[PDB]
């Protein structure tokens, strides 16, 4: 009762098992005193007691979970770490009851905010996949990794058996495909999430879990297998998966330099040679414009949509894979998952019908059995296609080379055609670059730095951070001076289109020009569009419009349009 053990007295487990030793009153009181003495006293090398600084922020966020690193608990009072690894279900009860004392020392009457606090363990120093688990692991703490395959809804559950409840949710976890050995199927396990941990993860995420490994009787398993076979589950204890002023100043430094637009385009898709216009269009789509709306009868999207007609093997699928790794959020082939992101299509009636609705709208609506509901698309579409068989025909307009309705070609902001042209010098350049890249990739720090800086003019980590910063912070606008010239150019282009008997230029093209100019302003972190932005946007759209036409019309257009496609 009154007397307490020394820490050295705990070195000898005196009962027949660990659990029956931890649960004794004098041992338990000793452990409680020692844990409280650790939590009030552990330090950085700089002093600066970390847990006194964490409890402080627990109340600043009105939170419920205190987080403890295992390495700190192993760095002093090692026996408590050993007992925690062996008997988590007991040790964590004592530790939670100590954590409440420590928090009330900062914030008296915190019990009125939350009645009970949970300790979360981090950095447990050994890991298993779902292969290595065996019966010896039962009731031990484990650390596991995988992909979350399926998730239930959240429900309340009765806490005690006057009443009290807690939140509950189950998650199915599967081995990551990179970990699975060759020629074997992946394994599965199911995880239980309680009060603070529900909806911490989403289906398809790759996730890391710490918790107790636990089992129970199940009648159906016994009945079907015909042997006394128990079922097992994991009870999670913790689950795992911005910028400074220095980054902002660095971004602004590079943006202040001349030619930053060209350098960003050059950094785009380093492994692919040539095809600068495709890289330009992809960069413009990833940065995008600004959305606008006028409740008097009109709305304008900020997203930029691009379509690429590809000869066989002209790098299309590689740049889509590159964009998939570059972009913040994306879908590859579902438009709900592409919300405020980029959507990627590499090959191609109901699918096309869905895309017809998606290009007309920015939000999707559906009804079924009298139910009615709505969803958001709000995304930029990058698509590629094979031109109606083995090879494109340049003598014909674009419609002859595609399996698309006319409004699709109207509503795509940018159209482009890529062809396997014949040139000895280009072939030699391609072949030299290809074998050079092949050698540079061979499995057989300084080597990496040289390789990286030869690969690109911008480090791509900085470029991804820069794209995210620009997308979240920069919102450009037009300047009202040169817009008279834009209107005159629009009228001139329409007059020339009619004069040669071309299909006419339209308001959609003018809108696309303004949107692309906004994107060009965003690329250099400029809140103003400028004359050169309008010039570049005009060149892109005019050249794209010219590429869609028949050959005789193409010659008349380029002869007249020389003062836009090349001059300004």
């Amino acid at each position: 009762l009154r007397e307490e053990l020394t820490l050295e007295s705990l070195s000898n487990v005196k009962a027949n098992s660990y659990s029956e030793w931890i649960t004794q009153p004098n041992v338990s009181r000793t452990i409680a005193r020692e844990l409280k003495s650790f939590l009030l006293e552990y330090t950085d090398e700089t002093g600066r007691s970390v847990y006194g600084a964490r409890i402080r922020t627990l109340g600043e966020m009105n939170s419920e979970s205190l987080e403890v690193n295992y390495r700190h608990l192993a760095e002093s009072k090692a026996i408590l770490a050993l007992f925690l690894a062996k008997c988590p279900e007991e040790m964590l009860k004592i530790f939670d009851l100590v954590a409440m004392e420590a928090t009330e020392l900062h914030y008296p009457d915190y019990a009125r905010i939350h009645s009970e606090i949970h300790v979360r363990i981090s950095d447990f120093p050994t890991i298993y996949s779902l292969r290595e688990l065996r019966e010896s692991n039962l009731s031990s703490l484990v650390r596991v990794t995988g992909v979350v395959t399926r998730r239930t809804g959240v429900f309340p559950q009765l806490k005690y058996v006057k009443t009290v409840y807690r939140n509950y949710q189950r998650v199915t976890l599967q081995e990551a495909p990179g970990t699975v050995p060759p020629g074997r199927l992946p394994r599965h396990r199911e995880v239980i999430l309680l009060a603070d941990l529900v909806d911490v993860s989403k289906p398809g995420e790759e996730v890391e879990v710490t918790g107790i490994y636990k089992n129970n009787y199940d009648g159906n398993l016994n009945a079907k297998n015909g042997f006394p076979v128990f079922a097992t589950i994991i009870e999670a204890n913790s689950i795992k998966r911005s910028w400074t002023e220095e980054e902002e100043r660095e971004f602004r430094k590079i943006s202040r330099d001349r030619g930053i637009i060209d350098k960003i385009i050059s950094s785009m898709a380093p492994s692919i040679y040539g095809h600068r216009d495709i890289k330009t269009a992809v960069a413009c789509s990833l940065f995008g414009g600004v959305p606008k709306n006028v409740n008097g009868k009109h709305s304008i999207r900020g997203d930029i949509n691009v379509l690429l007609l590809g000869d066989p093997g002209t790098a299309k699928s590689q740049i889509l894979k590159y964009v998939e790794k570059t972009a913040h959020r994306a879908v590859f082939a579902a438009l709900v998952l592409a919300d405020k992101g980029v959507c990627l299509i590499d090959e191609f009636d109901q699918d096309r019908t869905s895309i017809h609705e998606a290009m007309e709208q920015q939000s999707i609506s559906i009804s079924k059995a009298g139910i009615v509901t709505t969803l958001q698309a709000r995304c930029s579409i990058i698509a590629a296609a094979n031109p109606n068989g083995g090879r494109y025909n340049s003598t014909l307009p674009l419609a002859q080379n595609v399996s698309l309705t006319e409004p699709i070609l109207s509503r795509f902001d940018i159209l482009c055609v890529v062809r396997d042209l014949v040139d000895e010098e280009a072939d030699e350049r391609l072949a030299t670059f290809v074998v050079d890249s092949h050698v540079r990739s061979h499995p057989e720090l300084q080597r990496q730095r040289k390789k990286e800086e030869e690969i690109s003019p911008i480090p791509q980590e900085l470029l991804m951070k820069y794209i995210h910063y620009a997308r979240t912070k920069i919102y450009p606008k037009l300047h009202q001076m040169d817009m008279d010239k834009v209107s005159r150019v629009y009228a001139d282009l329409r007059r020339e289109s009619i004069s040669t008997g071309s299909f006419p230029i339209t308001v959609r093209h003018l809108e696309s020009i303004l949107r692309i100019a906004e994107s060009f302003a965003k690329m250099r972190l400029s809140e103003f569009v400028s004359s050169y932005d309008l010039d570049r946007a005009i060149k892109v759209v005019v050249d794209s419009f010219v590429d869609a036409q028949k050959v005789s019309v193409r010659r008349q257009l380029r002869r007249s349009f020389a003062i836009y496609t090349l001059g300004h």
Partner: protein, 311 residues
Amino acid sequence: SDEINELKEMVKDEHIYDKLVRSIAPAVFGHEAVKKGILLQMLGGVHKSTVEGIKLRGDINICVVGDPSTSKSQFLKYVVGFAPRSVYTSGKASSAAGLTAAVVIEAGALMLADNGICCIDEFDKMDISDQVAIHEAMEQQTISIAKAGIHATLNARTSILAAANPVGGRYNRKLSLRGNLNMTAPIMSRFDLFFVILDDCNEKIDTELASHIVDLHMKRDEAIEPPFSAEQLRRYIKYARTFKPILTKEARSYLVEKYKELRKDDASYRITVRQLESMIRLSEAIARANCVDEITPSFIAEAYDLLRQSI
């Protein structure tokens, strides 16, 4: 120790490459080109990836086209009877579910052939609805399942060996291979090598071929007399696959010249950048066959010469 001694003895030989080619499929008369292709597929290239995280395919796909009685199925029968990881499947009597994977989840043929050779016989009889499944798997070396609330992704690092019939049963020398073969252009674009077999009637060949066939029916084991034992050859192939050779400087200079020659011949299936990548794979396999850690330019001359027989 005796295994190591025997392996060292055959490794030391000057004429090892020729004997290895000669020891594939002992019962089939002639057709050394296909046998060489089978050996290089069996050894394989070197798998690798770039700084960008994109992967570069390290293995070889082969297709054999021929009019009837050309013994083309004997190559598939030998391969599935020899290679440690392999499966044999007929294009008529199989389903997309049975080829990739099926809900019951249980593994299909391409899953069992992971890190192995998968044999498709009478490919031209397969339904388009299932050819596209093989195409999607071959594009990614990956298989995907999503149905009934169950989702899964699986790895399929499998090399394909296929056999097919020309349309109308006999090949037309007036026409491209695309005209002769009932196969869609994206799938055709993904075979590293195509072999076309033709009767080419000739008394001096017939008089020998008939003798060879009658000897097989007259004596069971005695006729073939191969250069090596099968259990010897498998140990050699296991040993060879441990090498990871590196491309020499002179070979890099030589490759672009040979590729320019192919492009000028092209200026028939149109020659793309993929042919250069395939040629690199074949050169890696050739160097590995010889137990050499450097790609000598002679190996690329061999690979270029072998590849142009498919055109």
